[PDB]
């Protein structure tokens, strides 16, 4: 199946998913000088107070924390969005070394990692239906740089040893994703896609300008995961990022002057 290696990585994905060469693919490079401040954009509303985390899992391409999305608990609204989008899961992309790992780039700068908080539009009733709509999903993207530890990330780091290989999962209740957010909600936004197969063009991207810092030890633990299932071994889970795709006929808008 698809992956990030030489024979199954991003340059191969178009064969099974022709939309890989489509008009609104993600990620992209964010050219900070070209992105235009849009005074009509609204503050982003990130309401995560009643989030209910369920599980943590290694899906063979990242690790992911899942949430109960059957009611409006943890929701994203405002900013570029019309309506309400429910948090279903978050996951990460990271590198083999600190100078790569992010999917979006900023003036071609790659960060060590990137956090994606994936939300779907309640007007479509479930995430499967939402991925079939141009405004079905909103993904909040947050850059990670290496420096001080992020305390809110540690609960995640400490259980990664239990989900080393594809297919493994664990209980992961009472996790508060507010602890993964930077101070500022200044953001860039543009219409794009899922960055993993099926690459559906269903995402409004909201990428925060301010990175969070994580420690060397925290990201080191990401790098011990495996793409492979137990017994297939082994493909170390590193460099699970899609590179920047052509911007084509799109404008990136900034929420800040
Ligand atoms: O990040 C995508 C990746 O996560 C999985 C679960 O491991 O799917 C989750 O997220 C999808 C949206 O991106 C949802 O469509 C799906 O319902 C949810 O479980 C993988 O299937 C997917 O490749
Ligand atoms: Zn992602």
DSSP H or E segment with residue 222 = helix 216-222
Cis before residue 234, ω within 30 degrees of 0? yes
Residue showing tokens 């499967």: 128
Catalytic residue among 7, 12, 33, 61: 61
Query: In the chain, at which residue ranges do the beta strands (DSSP E only) sit?
Result: 29-30, 36-37, 44-47, 53-58, 63-67, 75-78, 85-94, 105-106, 113-121, 137-146, 169-171, 187-192, 203-208, 212-214, 253-254
Q: How far apart are the first and last CA of the chain?
A: 44
CA-only gyration radius of the chain, Å:
17
Distance between CA 32 and CA 209 in Å, rounded? 10
Any binding-site annotation on 195? yes
Domain ranges, residue 138: 1-257
Neighbours of 54 (CB within 10 A): 17
CA–centroid distance for 251 within its chain: 20
Distance 49 CA to ligand 2 centre (A): 23
Per DSSP, helices labelled H in 84-190 are 127-130, 154-157
Distance between CA 248 and CA 236 in Å, rounded? 33
CA neighbor of 94 nearest in space, from 68, 63, 131? 63
Find the angle CA(222)-CA(50)-CA(214) to the nearest 5 degrees: 25
DSSP 8-state code for residue 243: P
**Tokens read off for 3:** 């992956």
Is residue 167 helix, strand or coil? coil
Minimum-distance ligand 1 atom for the alpha carbon of 197: 23
Minimum-distance ligand 1 atom for the alpha carbon of 196: 23
Any binding-site annotation on 93? yes
CA neighbor of 162 nearest in space, from 77, 256, 58, 21? 58
Which CATH number fits the domain that encloses residue 70? 3.10.200.10
Residue showing tokens 């990401």: 222
**Tokens read off for 254:** 């900034």
DSSP assignment of 50-108 equals T--EEEEEE-SS-EEEEE--SSSSSEEEETT-SS-EEEEEEEEEE-SSTT---SSEETT
CA neighbor of 142 nearest in space, from 197, 192, 170, 179? 179
**Tokens read off for 216:** 């060397």
Residue showing tokens 């420096």: 147
| Domain count for the chain | 1
Residue showing tokens 């530890």: 149
The strand pair at 137-146 and 203-208 is best described as parallel
Distance 193 CA to ligand 1 centre (A): 13
Can 33 be counted among the known catalytic residues?
no
- Contact indicator for 114, 52 with CB cutoff of 8 Å: no
Residue 196, ligand 1, Cβ within 6 A:
yes
Distance between CA 146 and CA 98 in Å, rounded? 7
Distance between CA 153 and CA 45 in Å, rounded? 22
Measured in angstroms, the resolution is: 1.5
What does the chain come to in residues? 257
Residue showing tokens 């995402």: 203
The strand pair at 29-30 and 36-37 is best described as unpaired
Neighbours of 179 (CB within 10 A): 15
- Contact indicator for 66, 89 with CB cutoff of 8 Å: yes
**Tokens read off for 243:** 């590179």
């Amino acid at each position: 199946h698809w992956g990030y290696g030489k024979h199954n990585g991003p340059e191969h994905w178009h064969k099974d998913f022709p939309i890989a060469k489509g008009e609104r693919q993600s990620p992209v490079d964010i050219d900070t000088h070209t992105a235009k401040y849009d005074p009509s954009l609204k503050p982003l509303s990130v309401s995560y107070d009643q989030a209910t985390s369920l599980r943590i899992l290694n899906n063979g391409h990242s690790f992911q924390v899942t949430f109960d999305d059957s009611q409006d608990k943890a929701v994203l609204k405002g900013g570029p969005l019309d309506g309400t989008y429910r948090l279903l899961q978050f996951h990460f992309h990271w590198g083999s070394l600190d100078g790569q790992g992010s999917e979006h780039t900023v003036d071609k700068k790659k960060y060590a990692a990137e956090l994606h908080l994936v939300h779907w539009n309640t007007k479509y009733g479930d995430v499967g239906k939402a991925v079939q709509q141009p405004d079905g999903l909103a993904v909040l993207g947050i850059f990670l740089k290496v420096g001080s530890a992020k305390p809110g990330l540690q609960k995640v780091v400490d259980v990664l040893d239990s989900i080393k290989t594809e297919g493994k999962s664990a209980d992961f209740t009472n996790f508060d994703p507010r602890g993964l957010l930077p101070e500022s909600l200044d953001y860039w936004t543009y219409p794009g896609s899922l960055t993993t197969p099926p690459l559906a063009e269903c995402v409004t991207w909201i990428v925060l300008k301010e990175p969070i810092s994580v420690s060397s030890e925290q990201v080191l633990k990401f790098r011990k995961l495996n793409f492979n299932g137990e017994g297939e071994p082994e493909e170390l889970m590193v460099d699970n990022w899609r590179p920047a795709q052509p911007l084509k006929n799109r404008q990136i808008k900034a929420s800040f002057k």
